[PDB]
């Protein structure tokens, strides 16, 4: 609240300093921000406690940055950490005390939890509460009465208005409890699902599952883990532990195929017991219980085919023990979020690797699914070797004079097609791909513009995937990329970042970017994080190139996009020029070739 002569929030008169400040490695700002030291001997204990009570926002190598909120404190109480149980240790760890503001915030957030519980039984959602005064003073506003369908006090509530009531309670200061007591539940018989000994659970996966499984009861929440960390394995393990009907929701055909493959690989459940509720191909969805489908199909708003209608009616009628949702960052979308109310599930687990977006709809996930149980530390995984170390780099390509002339001259938005296609970067990607091809490194080119992707792919006679790309041709291209030595590069469109089962790749070039989006950047970076069989962290075997055009909005897009990665700790090295480019023969060298490319770009319209 106090501002120094600089942008300095002054706290000299706010909180004191502990005498044994050197011993205490923890800081506590009044706003809730906490700065932990990664060099302290008690760093592991401090990390565990701060991860338990707070969500990371920036975890560089030296000083980690966390911030706590109501949802994080509710998650702490869910895992069973009382207000004293957290605040006493926070004061002990803190080297500068705990401000009264944070003290009262923690007290209020902890006490305002568990008073209101939401339990669904016999297809009816009852808002139970041991304390009756909570309901007595909660029925002040008329929205509750119009919502409700027309000790231990409970009342039934309308199915459709659950989301509205939950978001209302979040700001009403009475969070709802979504804990599932699967240990004590006789209404729905347990399913015959078991986890085979073949599956191996990594320490971080076990820690996330422990956060998820506070007790005998399965908690509904979101677990953020890197794509290469085995989030699919974690989800399969969660379903196997639940041992009840499980509905996994992907985001695309590749996602559903990968989910079925993971289920078969890691679970002893028979093939016939798994179905793919996919329009392209189906395996009798009504026949078996364990199902994998897609948000688009479940939330489809237009006319439904007859068979799909029957399947949808069966899904709506049945009750699901577990609802796994991959790539939860897309859930708050209108159609995708409609699926939550369309389908019924006791606990809806959420898995993803890039839980970040610009519009302030990520906060809605806390009530749409539940509090964020865990977020894997990418740097720690890199150190442990579970994820391949990546040498993240941004190659700066100076824009050619003429191309810059038209780009600046035109105030229209042909620049997206223009700066994405310039001789300096076209020569760059070609030369980089040649250098890695002779180095036997697998390449996954990325480009948002399908037009530019197709032009580059035809000029380099490479198998670009995008748009309609038939499913059969997609699978054939992926198989050729994985197996055929003669081909070691695939040009994937935006569809790649949505949800792809792809083989580990040694390099990832990105010629174009959709925008300054930290979701797409992290999603595409996660592809190369797949740890190799016997690599080493310091070898920097994995490479990521984000080609940008100098003196263009792409520079702004790239800076507005690498924020999340730099917060994690990756250092993006800038490459002004590439050695050997002049000697290597590449197209668009002489002025004439650049001229024809510019003419084609202009005629593109």
């Amino acid at each position: 609240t106090k501002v120094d002569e600089y942008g300095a929030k002054d706290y000299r008169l706010q909180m004191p300093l502990k005498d044994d400040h050197t011993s205490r490695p923890l800081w506590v700002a009044p706003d809730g921000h906490i700065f932990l030291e990664a060099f302290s001997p008690v760093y592991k204990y401090a990390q565990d406690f701060l991860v338990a009570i707070a969500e990371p926002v920036c975890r560089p190598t030296h000083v980690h940055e966390y911030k706590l909120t109501a949802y994080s404190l509710y998650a702490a109480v869910s895992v069973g950490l009382q207000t004293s149980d957290i605040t006493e240790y926070l004061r002990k760890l803190s080297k500068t005390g705990v401000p009264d503001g944070i003290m009262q915030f923690i007290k209020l957030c902890t006490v305002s939890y568990g008073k209101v519980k939401l339990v669904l039984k016999h297809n009816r959602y009852f808002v139970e509460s041991c304390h009756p005064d909570v309901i007595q003073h909660l029925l002040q506003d008329p929205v509750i009465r119009e919502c409700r369908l027309r000790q231990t006090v409970s009342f039934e509530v309308k199915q459709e208005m659950i989301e509205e009531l939950q978001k209302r309670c979040i700001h009403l200061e009475y969070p709802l409890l979504a804990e599932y007591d699967f240990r004590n539940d006789s209404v729905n018989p347990d399913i015959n699902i078991d986890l085979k000994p073949t599956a191996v659970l990594r320490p971080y996966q076990e820690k996330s599952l422990r956060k998820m499984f506070g007790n005998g009861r399965a908690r509904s929440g979101v677990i953020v883990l890197p794509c290469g960390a085995g989030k699919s394995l974690v989800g399969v393990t969660a379903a196997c532990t639940v041992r009840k009907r499980c509905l996994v929701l992907g985001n695309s055909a590749v996602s559903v195929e990968q989910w079925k493959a993971q289920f078969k690989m890691w679970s002893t459940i028979d093939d016939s017991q798994i179905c793919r509720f996919t329009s392209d191909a189906k395996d009798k969805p009504i026949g078996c219980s364990v199902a994998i489908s897609t948000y688009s199909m479940l939330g489809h708003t237009t006319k439904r085919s007859w068979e799909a209608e029957r399947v949808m009616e069966w899904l709506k009628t049945q009750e699901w023990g577990l609802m796994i949702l991959d790539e939860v960052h897309t859930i708050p979308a209108k159609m995708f979020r409609r699926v939550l109310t369309i389908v019924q599930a006791h606990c809806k687990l959420g898995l993803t690797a890039t839980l970040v977006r610009e519009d302030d709809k990520i906060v809605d996930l806390n009530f749409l699914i539940g509090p964020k149980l865990y977020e894997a530390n990418w740097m720690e995984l890199q150190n442990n070797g579970y994820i391949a170390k990546v040498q993240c780099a941004e190659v700066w390509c100076p824009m050619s004079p003429e191309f810059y002339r038209e780009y600046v001259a035109i105030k229209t938005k042909k620049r997206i097609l223009l700066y994405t296609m310039n001789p300096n970067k076209f020569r760059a990607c070609q030369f980089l791909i040649k250098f890695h091809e002779r180095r036997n490194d697998k390449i996954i080119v990325f480009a948002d513009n399908v037009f530019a992707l197709k032009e580059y792919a035809i000029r380099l006679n490479k198998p670009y995937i995008y748009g309609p790309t038939s499913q059969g041709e997609r699978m054939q291209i992926l198989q050729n990329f994985k197996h055929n030595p003669k081909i070691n590069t695939i040009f994937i469109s935006k569809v790649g970042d949505t949800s792809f089962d792809l083989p580990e790749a040694n390099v990832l070039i990105q010629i174009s970017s959709h925008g300054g989006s930290r979701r797409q950047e992290a999603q595409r970076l996660g592809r190369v994080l797949r740890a190799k069989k016997g690599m080493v962290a310091e070898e920097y075997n994995a490479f990521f190139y984000s080609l940008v055009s100098q003196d263009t909005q792409e520079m702004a897009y790239s800076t507005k996009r690498q924020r999340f990665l730099v917060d994690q700790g990756y250092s993006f090295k800038v490459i002004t020029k590439l050695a050997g480019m002049e000697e290597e023969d590449l197209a668009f060298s002489t002025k004439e070739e650049q001229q024809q490319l510019l003419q084609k770009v202009l005629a593109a319209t």
Binding site: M399, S400, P401, E402, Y404, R405, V408, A409, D551
Partner: protein, 54 residues
């Protein structure tokens, strides 16, 4: 004149302002080469504002 050393691809940026500005008779008075232009003395500080969009 005022000798101004610039980039060949950026030389035409000041030429577009010549055909658009109606203050004087002609902005650019002499063009040596692709990296050398001349100018009536008065628009270096004004050009610094256009760096935010360039």
């Amino acid at each position: 004149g005022v000798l101004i050393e610039c980039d060949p691809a950026m030389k035409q940026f000041l030429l577009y302002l010549d055909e658009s500005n109606a203050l004087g008779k002609k902005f650019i008075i002499q063009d040596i080469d692709d990296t050398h232009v001349f100018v009536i003395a008065e628009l270096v500080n004004v050009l610094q504002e256009r760096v935010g969009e360039l």
